[PDB]
Subunit: 66 residues, 12 copies
């Protein structure tokens, strides 16, 4: 059951969950300050994740460091 | 369930989800500005994903960049 | 479910979904201009995919 | 759920589906011109696939390039 | 379900499917001329496949050529 | 389901299917002439396979 | 079920469990002092985990 | 669903099936002459196999050549 | 089901299990003196494990020592 | 289901199956003379196998010889 | 279905099972003298295992030799 | 189901099966003399195995 690891590399990074279903809207925005990590799953409610700001991101497919 | 990772390499990248089913239309477009990342699942509503604009994309099959 | 990755290397590449079932016809053609990417699954409705135009294609079997 | 990748290397290549069941007959013939690719699954209706003409073919078992 | 890949190395190759069940007879023969390829599943009707003629054959177990 | 690959290296190779169940007898013998190939599955009806004659044989365990 | 490993490298590291469901709020914060280790699963109730403070973190994806 | 490969290296090799159940007795003995191969499964009726005589034997665990 | 391995590197190491569910409290603490080892599963009652004191810990993800 | 491979290195090797269940007794002993091989499954009746005499034994865990 | 291998390296080593459920208490203590081995599963009744004394311990995660 | 391989390196090695359930007691001890081999499964009835005496032991975790 897949998840994403997200480490903020600066202040005020946002990790935003988007709603599962016919409709797509942001249901929640988690704020990360520098060096804070968010380990976040895809779930019954979240089918897409947006990251804004400079962040090191780990997934099953590998790494993308801003 | 499988997911794509999309990082924007310029401003104004569109990640477009196509409806699952007999019919195919765009149901949602997500604008990504430079540096921003979207990780998006295939879902009971999205069976095809379309990226317009300069992107770095990881899937289960490998990298595809530009 | 398995999927294909198609990157258009010219304008007007067509990604064509053929119908699942006894009958085979196309039900949709997605057009990509140069540089655009389609990630497309096999589904309840699409059992074959035809790309026409120059494309870089990735599947579970390789490039 | 297995599939075959078929890339025509000349004009007028045919990819022919054969019917699943007691009876075997061609139910459909897809024409490929040079450089067109067909990614085709085995399905409830197709249990065999014939390719006529010069074609690069990819499957789980590897490659056969005419 | 598993499948065989047969490429004809001369004209007039026969790919023959044998009936699944208590009884065993040929139910279908597919003629392949030189260069042509058949990818054929084992099915609820075919439990044994027979190739006559010069062929290149790939299965899950490896190559067998001539 | 698992399968065997048999290539005949002489004329008149016999691929013999033995019956699944309490009783063991052959129910079928498929004959191959030199160069012919049989790919044969274990099935509801065949639980053992005997090859007689010179053959190159491939199974999941090797050659 | 998958889990995370968190080792605190300062005092007062917070391991925060965010709620599973339509609503997202924290339901618990576990505090670790320097050197302490939390191994924590994703559960029926926690679908996201935020670490705040300097920590060495291990997941199935690496360090 | 496990099987054993047995190749007789001399004349008059026996491959003997033993009965599954509380009771153990030989239910069948297959005779192999030199260079004959038997590919034999474990089944609802056979839970042990005995080989007598000089034989090359292949299983999941590797090879034992008399 | 997955488990952790904890070896105490000093006297007085605490292995604490946290309750699974909507609520989170300590339900049990296990004191380990130097040299002693605990292997503990995640369970229908414990969804998070906490180690205080100098420990060597192995999990499915690797070693973590001190 | 898993199986053991036993090759006799001398005459009079015994392969003994122990009953599965609350009780444990020998239910069958199979004499193997030198060179002979037994491949025997664990079954709904045999949950432990005992070899007396000089044997070469392969299991899923590796070789054990003498 | 996971298990732990435990080999006592001195006299009077204890392997203690702890109860599965809301409650945690020692339900059993197995005494090992030097060079005795215990191969012990996690079960419906045992969700944690404590080892006291100098012992070589093998699990899925590797080795810890006192 | 998983199993253990025990080869006795002296006379009178005991392979002891401990009972599965709330209660833990031995229900059986299989004795091996030098050179004898026991391959033994974990079962509905045996959840722990104790070897006493010098033995070479193989499990899924190694030797
Ligand atoms: N509401 C959409 C969210 C989504 C997932 N993947 C996407 C890809 C593109 C656009 C939107 C999406 C869905 O559940 O399907
Ligand atoms: N069949 C999908 C859309 C789709 C997937 N792959 C395709 C390839 C080409 C065209 C459309 C598609 C649907 O449910 O609508
Ligand atoms: N209508 C066909 C489409 C198809 C899938 N694979 C094929 C291979 C060859 C020809 C057609 C096909 C089907 O569902 O079966
Ligand atoms: N009607 C046949 C088609 C087929 C599949 N594999 C074959 C091999 C040989 C000949 C025919 C076939 C079937 O479904 O079984
Ligand atoms: N048992 C298959 C045919 C078959 C498979 N493998 C064989 C080997 C030898 C002879 C026949 C067979 C059937 O259903 O008829
Ligand atoms: N009639 C036997 C055929 C068989 C399978 N494997 C064997 C091994 C040895 C002897 C006979 C067999 C059965 O179904 O069980
Ligand atoms: N309440 C959210 C928590 C969450 C999980 N993954 C996320 C990713 C982004 C934002 C929030 C989340 C949910 O269960 O779906
Ligand atoms: N009747 C026995 C046959 C058997 C299988 N494995 C064995 C090992 C030893 C002795 C006999 C056996 C059974 O089904 O269990
Ligand atoms: N959600 C778990 C506890 C838990 C797991 N991971 C966490 C991370 C942070 C906080 C609490 C937790 C519970 O059932 O109570
Ligand atoms: N528990 C098995 C026998 C057994 C398996 N492993 C053991 C180890 C020791 C003693 C007995 C056993 C039975 O059903 O009887
Ligand atoms: N009674 C506890 C035992 C336990 C398992 N893992 C633990 C970790 C820490 C403390 C206690 C435990 C349970 O079944 O959950
Ligand atoms: N009666 C115990 C036997 C046991 C298995 N693993 C253990 C670990 C430690 C102590 C006892 C055990 C049980 O079934 O649970």
């Amino acid at each position: 059951s897949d998840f994403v690891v997200i480490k903020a590399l600066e202040d005020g990074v946002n990790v935003i969950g988007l709603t599962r279903g016919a409709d797509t809207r942001f249901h929640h925005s988690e704020k990360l300050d520098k060096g804070e990590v968010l380990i976040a799953q895809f779930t019954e409610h979240t089918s897409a994740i947006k990251v804004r700001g400079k962040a090191y991101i780990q997934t099953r497919h590998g790494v993308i460091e801003s």
